[PDB]
Amino acid sequence: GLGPLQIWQTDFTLEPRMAPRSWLAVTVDTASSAIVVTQHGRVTSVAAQHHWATAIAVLGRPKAIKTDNGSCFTSKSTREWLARWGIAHTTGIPGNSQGQAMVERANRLLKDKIRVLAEGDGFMKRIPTSKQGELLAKAMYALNHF
């Protein structure tokens, strides 16, 4: 009962191998280190809400989420969506510096796993679109379980 708080860190990261939906939305559960990733065609507020809808189904509802001040995260729409769910939102400190370091380490382990699985399949450039889906699933698998 003295366990970790259910706080998430989310961010978006660009990955051209995953084009056209090359914007990967990544969420790290700081309680368990689990990771949830979704792809999007454009960074929008709505992209951020859809990514969270999916992470919540997978991780359960957090008590809070930390993001940077990107505008897709502090727009009105996003504040209202998070309010409707009852989740608190913080963008940390104005000149944070650090503080979002797990989601950033996550971003880097993820892109690396994607490159190594993609190349294992013989794709050295963009991944065929029909194949990105299982590859992105496979990457997430590899970083969360086995």
Q: Is 29 annotated as a binding residue?
A: no
According to DSSP, residue 41 is labeled: S
46 token code pair: 């709505």
Exactly one of 14, 33, 57, 108 binds a second copy (CB under 8 A); that residue is 57
Question: What are the CA-CA distances from residue 18 to residues 102, 118, 128 (Å)?
Answer: 22, 10, 8
Exactly one of 11, 24, 29, 49 binds Ca ion (CB under 5 A); that residue is 11
Q: With CB cut-offs between 5 and 8 Å by kind, which of a second copy, Ca ion, none does residue 11 bind? A: Ca ion
Contact present, 17 and 127 (Cβ < 8 Å): yes
- Total residues contacting Ca ion by CB under 5 A comes to 3
Contact present, 43 and 26 (Cβ < 8 Å): no
Query: Does residue 68 bind Ca ion (CB under 5 A)?
Result: yes
Q: Which residues, 6+ apart, have CB-to-CB distance to 103 below 8 Å?
A: 9, 10, 11, 26, 27, 28
Query: Does residue 104 bind Ca ion (CB under 5 A)?
Result: no
Query: Does residue 56 bind a second copy (CB under 8 A)?
Result: yes
Of the pair 75, 144, the CB lying nearest a second copy is at 144
Contact present, 20 and 129 (Cβ < 8 Å): yes
Residues annotated within a binding site for Mg(2+)? 11, 68, 104
Residues that bind Ca ion (CB under 5 A): 11, 68, 70
Sites of contact with a second copy (CB under 8 A): 49-50, 53-54, 56-58, 60-61, 133-134, 137-138, 140-141, 144-146
